């Protein structure tokens, strides 16, 4: 189940200055970058155009190109419409896309965050405020819902254009998505917290456990999944032990890249 994300982030410092940058993810892999400086959207994968024709992508890029400008003036006008109830600096994020499921099944989303808090979502045919959101947002919402063009466009994009495009992406990016990368493991200790460093594995699912021969340790504490530059994963596991207990122990790593060939690393 791959989740497709178009991540927009807009900074409004004062009444005049502002910028908007976008990044696009299919799963844990980046497909597009759209910097504020770049008038056009940039592909970050050879397969980022999915199964779309050149005309189709162009009609779709031009649509977004207009949106970015439209969005910039619109916020500034909504700030004026609200003032003094809202004030600069203003920080707005958008998480929009569609998650894919077996068959031709998918669910689309458009989530808007105001000042680091999730406040607004597009649902069905209209914009609405989420629970917890302030009541003054009802007016901007009403105004956006007045615009029937945007509503029709967003419905098409969320209902049709998102899942159609991602179904095309999965075919074009199979080799990169279904790619397998072997993890590399090394050990260290710190004043002793025994660490099992694991790096360079793809996909993201992994199994790293400390074992005293067969004894799966109850004190194994897995850390956070941290990224690498070459689009692979890094993770570490810290064990809580006393001095002298260094020998006799090992770190075992299970991954799809090895296929039964479990890495076992003795200290």
């Amino acid at each position, epitope marked *: 189940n791959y989740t497709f994300r178009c991540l927009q982030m807009s900074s409004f410092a004062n009444r005049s200055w502002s910028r908007t940058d976008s990044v696009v993810w299919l799963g844990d892999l980046q497909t597009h970058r759209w910097s504020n400086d770049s008038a056009t959207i940039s592909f970050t994968k050879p397969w980022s155009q999915g199964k779309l024709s050149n005309q189709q992508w162009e009609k779709l890029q031009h649509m977004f190109q*207009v949106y970015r400008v*439209s969005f910039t003036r619109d916020i500034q*006008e909504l700030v004026k*419409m609200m003032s003094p109830k809202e004030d600069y600096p203003i920080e707005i994020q958008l998480s929009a896309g569609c998650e894919m499921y077996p068959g031709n099944a998918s669910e689309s989303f458009l989530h808007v965050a105001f000042q680091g808090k999730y406040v607004v979502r597009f649902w069905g045919t209209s914009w609405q405020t989420v629970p917890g959101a302030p009541s003054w947002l009802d*007016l901007p919402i009403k*105004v*956006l819902n*007045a*615009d029937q063009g*945007t509503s029709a466009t967003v419905q098409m994009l969320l209902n049709d254009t998102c899942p159609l495009f991602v179904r095309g992406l999965l075919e074009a990016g199979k080799s990169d998505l279904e790619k397998q990368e072997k993890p590399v493991a090394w050990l260290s200790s710190v004043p002793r917290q025994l660490v099992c460093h694991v790096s360079g594995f793809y996909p993201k699912p992994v199994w790293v456990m400390w074992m005293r021969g067969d004894q799966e340790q109850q004190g194994t504490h897995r850390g956070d999944f941290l990224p690498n530059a070459d689009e692979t994963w890094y993770l570490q596991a810290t064990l809580d032990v006393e001095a002298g207990e260094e020998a006799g122990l090992a770190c075992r790593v299970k991954h799809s890249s090895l296929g039964g060939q479990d890495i076992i690393l003795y200290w």
Partner: T-cell receptor, first 111, second 113 residues
Framework: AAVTQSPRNKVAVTGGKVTLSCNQT?????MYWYRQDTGHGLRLIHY???????EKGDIPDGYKASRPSQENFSLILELATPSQTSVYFC??????????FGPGTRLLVLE | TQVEQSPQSLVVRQGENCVLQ??????????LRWFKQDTGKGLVSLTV?????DKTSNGRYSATLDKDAKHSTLHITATLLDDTATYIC?????????????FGAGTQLIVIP
């Protein structure tokens, strides 16, 4: 929807204070001040998103705007000039795109 | 000036048809509206076009919108003496109150009785 303007027609002197009024009982949040000049289309001067609000338009110089209430939106010319001789149009509207225009105000500033 | 009207002025005889042009570069083009302004009077709306390819008709008035060409025409069928007025093209950049309207200078029409 109805929008009224007062006065309908006005003659003023350079340096004098002139207040053009606009009344709307449509309960519209938004109200707009334009001027019409031969050779140009209507150009925006000032606009308000509700009581208290006022925002500069495309050509705001020489004009001050006041929105005392939902009902009324005034254009104030502090020190009148012959360059401000024009037909001034007022418009109002809700959250939709439709702007409902008043009858229009002819202003003539003489020396 | 993102809105341009043609002709600047024209003179027709009672009964004949006349077509009025409007070309614009306004981005985006949500809707286009036609106004009739009798000399000294205010702005009477004639019609409003909204679709990518659009056609409307209000009595003897009929207008067409082609957004791809960013171009619009207003045909007046069987002109009457009453039609002597300036006809104004107006493009709005949003489908809500966030929009700003962009006004053409107007095509002048004089109908000979």
């Amino acid at each position: 929807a109805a929008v009224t303007q007062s006065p309908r027609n006005k003659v003023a002197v350079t340096g004098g204070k002139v207040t053009l009024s606009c009344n709307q009982t449509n309960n519209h949040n938004n109200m707009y001040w334009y001027r019409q000049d031969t050779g140009h289309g209507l150009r925006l001067i000032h606009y308000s998103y509700g009581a208290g609000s006022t925002e500069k338009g495309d050509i705001p110089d020489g004009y001050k705007a006041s929105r005392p209430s939902q009902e009324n939106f005034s254009l104030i010319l502090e020190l009148a000039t012959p360059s401000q001789t024009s037909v001034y149009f007022c418009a109002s509207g809700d959250e939709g795109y439709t702007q409902y225009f008043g009858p229009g105000t002819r202003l003539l500033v003489l020396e | 000036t993102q809105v341009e009207q043609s002709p600047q002025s024209l003179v027709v005889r009672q009964g004949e048809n006349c077509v009025l042009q409007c070309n614009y570069s306004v981005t985006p083009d949500n809707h286009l509206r036609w106004f009739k302004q009798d000399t000294g009077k205010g702005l009477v709306s004639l019609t409003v076009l909204v679709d990518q390819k659009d056609k409307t008709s209000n009595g003897r008035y009929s207008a067409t919108l082609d957004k791809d060409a960013k171009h619009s025409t207003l045909h007046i069928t069987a002109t009457l003496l009453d039609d002597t007025a300036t006809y104004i093209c107006v493009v709005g950049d949003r489908g809500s109150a966030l929009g700003r309207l962009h006004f053409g200078a107007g095509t002048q029409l004089i109908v000979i009785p």
